[PDB]
Amino acid sequence: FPATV
Amino acid sequence: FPATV
Amino acid sequence: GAMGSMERASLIQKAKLAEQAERYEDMAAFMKGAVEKGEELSNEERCLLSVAYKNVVGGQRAAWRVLSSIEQKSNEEGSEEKGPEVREYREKVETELQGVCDTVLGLLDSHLIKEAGDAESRVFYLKMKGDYYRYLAEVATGDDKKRIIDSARSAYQEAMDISKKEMPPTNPIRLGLALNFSVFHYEIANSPEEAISLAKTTFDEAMADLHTLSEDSYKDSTLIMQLLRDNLTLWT
Amino acid sequence: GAMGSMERASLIQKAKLAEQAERYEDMAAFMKGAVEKGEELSNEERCLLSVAYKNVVGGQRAAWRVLSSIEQKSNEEGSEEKGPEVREYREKVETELQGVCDTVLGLLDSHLIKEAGDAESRVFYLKMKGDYYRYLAEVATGDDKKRIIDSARSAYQEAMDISKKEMPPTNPIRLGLALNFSVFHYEIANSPEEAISLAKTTFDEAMADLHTLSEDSYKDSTLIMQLLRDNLTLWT
Numbered sequence: 048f049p050a051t052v
Numbered sequence: 053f054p055a056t057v
Numbered sequence: 058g059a060m061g062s063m064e065r066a067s068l069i070q071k072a073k074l075a076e077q078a079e080r081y082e083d084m085a086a087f088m089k090g091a092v093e094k095g096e097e098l099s100n101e102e103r104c105l106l107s108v109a110y111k112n113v114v115g116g117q118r119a120a121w122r123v124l125s126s127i128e129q130k131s132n133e134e135g136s137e138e139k140g141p142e143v144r145e146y147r148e149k150v151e152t153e154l155q156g157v158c159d160t161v162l163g164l165l166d167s168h169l170i171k172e173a174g175d176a177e178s179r180v181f182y183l184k185m186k187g188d189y190y191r192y193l194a195e196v197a198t199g200d201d202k203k204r205i206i207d208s209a210r211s212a213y214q215e216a217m218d219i220s221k222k223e224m225p226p227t228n229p230i231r232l233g234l235a236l237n238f239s240v241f242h243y244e245i246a247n248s249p250e251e252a253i254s255l256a257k258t259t260f261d262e263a264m265a266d267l268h269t270l271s272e273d274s275y276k277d278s279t280l281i282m283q284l285l286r287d288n289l290t291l292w293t
Numbered sequence: 294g295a296m297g298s299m300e301r302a303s304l305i306q307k308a309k310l311a312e313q314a315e316r317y318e319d320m321a322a323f324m325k326g327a328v329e330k331g332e333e334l335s336n337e338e339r340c341l342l343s344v345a346y347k348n349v350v351g352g353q354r355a356a357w358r359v360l361s362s363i364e365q366k367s368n369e370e371g372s373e374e375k376g377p378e379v380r381e382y383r384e385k386v387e388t389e390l391q392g393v394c395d396t397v398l399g400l401l402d403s404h405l406i407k408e409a410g411d412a413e414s415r416v417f418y419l420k421m422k423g424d425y426y427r428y429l430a431e432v433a434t435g436d437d438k439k440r441i442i443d444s445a446r447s448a449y450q451e452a453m454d455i456s457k458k459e460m461p462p463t464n465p466i467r468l469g470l471a472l473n474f475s476v477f478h479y480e481i482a483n484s485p486e487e488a489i490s491l492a493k494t495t496f497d498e499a500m501a502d503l504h505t506l507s508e509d510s511y512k513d514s515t516l517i518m519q520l521l522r523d524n525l526t527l528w529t
């Protein structure tokens with residue numbers, strides 16, 4: 048996972 | 053929690 | 058709806074309790090019930106809705122990735138035929154994930170987006186629409202895969218267009234949208250250069266606007282800017 | 294049962310996949326389906342059953358404790374009346390937890406215990422029976438509270454009697470039973486001296502038997518002995 052919000 | 057298994 | 062008989066305020070209160078108890082499926086069901094009361098959501102209520110479903114689907118995605126990895130290793134040459142069980146169980150998790158995405162997209166379409174007139178609400182909901190089509194795209198393989206990808210792109214793009222016209226570059230909703238759309242480009246659209254360009258331009262434009270912010274707003278904006286930098290470091 | 298049409302071996306395979314994916318509710322449903330095939334369980338299958346339900350109910354207990362703490366703080370003097378919502382939601386989690394306990398106890402009574410003739414299976418199932426009555430006791434307040442507590446005590450005691458006659462003092466099932474029965478004494482029966490005496494005697498008798506063990510068995514026995522010591526340190 049790359050960062051997501 | 054004390055330890056239980 | 059099983060929440061139809063509960064007061065809107067009680068649903069919101071219980072969603073907050075469920076969050077404290079880390080009961081995210083309950084939290085999502087409470088927030089679904091609150092949305093279905095038909096009234097628009099406040100900023101805090103939108104946050105509760107998004108956090109609830111992000112946690113539910115995040116657990117499903119993590120499980121799907123574990124099972125898909127096992128399924129691929131079982132389909133290599135030299136692996137022993139383990140039967141249909143891995144595929145079946147991956148499909149079961151996948152169908153449950155698709156159901157959750159369809160539920161969220163259904164709430165956005167009926168009727169959160171059409172009643173959202175302020176930038177902060179409309180951008181937030183369009184970002185969510187892009188996110189949940191993105192989660193569908195992660196598992197999609199059929200005739201509609203390209204249309205699922207483009208539904209995510211279209212939602213994100215409309216949110217970007219509104220955010221660039223109506224919000225400052227440090228607005229956390231605008232930043233979170235750009236973060237996620239950049240990940241869409243990298244992981245879904247096979248467009249790493251677009252992902253990197255979007256993350257860098259977003260970061261730099263926010264940096265130049267931080268001087269306008271209070272300490273509280275600075276903390277929120279810089280938190281998401283750090284995520285942009287984290288992804289840029291992963292990708293370059 | 295929703296698992297009635299699936300092969301026993303496929304249920305066990307999927308329970309293992311669910312464990313890898315940290316999908317413990319699925320894992321428990323698969324193992325429930327396997328038990329309901331009517332055949333006795335192997336040692337590994339008993340482990341899968343116990344780990345699945347321990348994780349499900351463990352999450353429920355943690356959530357119940359969060360909500361009960363909030364409920365008690367809302368009922369002190371000076372606190373603002375927040376309405377029935379905290380109690381209602383604590384009750385909802387409590388009812389779901391009781392349902393899971395009733396399900397496990399139902400599997401043990403129909404018919405795992407009555408068919409368990411070897412010490413390793415019978416002691417394991419009687420320990421589970423004590424554990425799930427103990428979880429019911431943690432939330433019990435009604436006319437049957439004392440009988441729930443005594444049902445846990447009775448199950449644990451029968452398991453202890455068999456374990457002392459049929460298993461070495463280092464057997465991990467015997468050790469885990471004693472660990473949990475000791476916690477029952479401390480937390481449920483308001484008998485801290487009995488809890489401490491049981492943990493100390495169990496630890497010391499296992500210590501004196503470690504010299505008989507292989508390296509693999511030593512690792513399993515000493516793991517549980519460390520938990521006994523951890524509790525003794527908490528309590529003294």
Ligand SMILES: *SCCNC(=O)C(C)(C)Oc1cc(Cl)cc(Cl)c1
Nearest residue numbers: 052103104107108229230233234277
């Ligand atoms: S909505 C949750 C409150 N905001 C935040 O936690 C953060 C500052 C990270 O911003 C943010 C969160 C979420 Cl869930 C979505 C967006 Cl677009 C922004």
Ligand SMILES: *SCCNC(=O)C(C)(C)Oc1cc(Cl)cc(Cl)c1
Nearest residue numbers: 057339340343344465466469470513
């Ligand atoms: S049954 C799981 C395998 N055994 C263990 O992990 C351990 C050595 C801790 O022993 C053990 C586990 C469980 Cl879940 C129950 C008992 Cl009685 C003993």
Ligand SMILES: [Mg+2]
Nearest residue numbers: 063064065066
């Ligand atoms: Mg009303």
Ligand SMILES: [Mg+2]
Nearest residue numbers: 148151152196
């Ligand atoms: Mg499918």
Ligand SMILES: [Mg+2]
Nearest residue numbers: 251254255258
């Ligand atoms: Mg551009």
Ligand SMILES: [Mg+2]
Nearest residue numbers: 299300301302
């Ligand atoms: Mg069969």
Ligand SMILES: [Mg+2]
Nearest residue numbers: 384387388432
């Ligand atoms: Mg009750």
Ligand SMILES: [Mg+2]
Nearest residue numbers: 487490491494
């Ligand atoms: Mg004694």
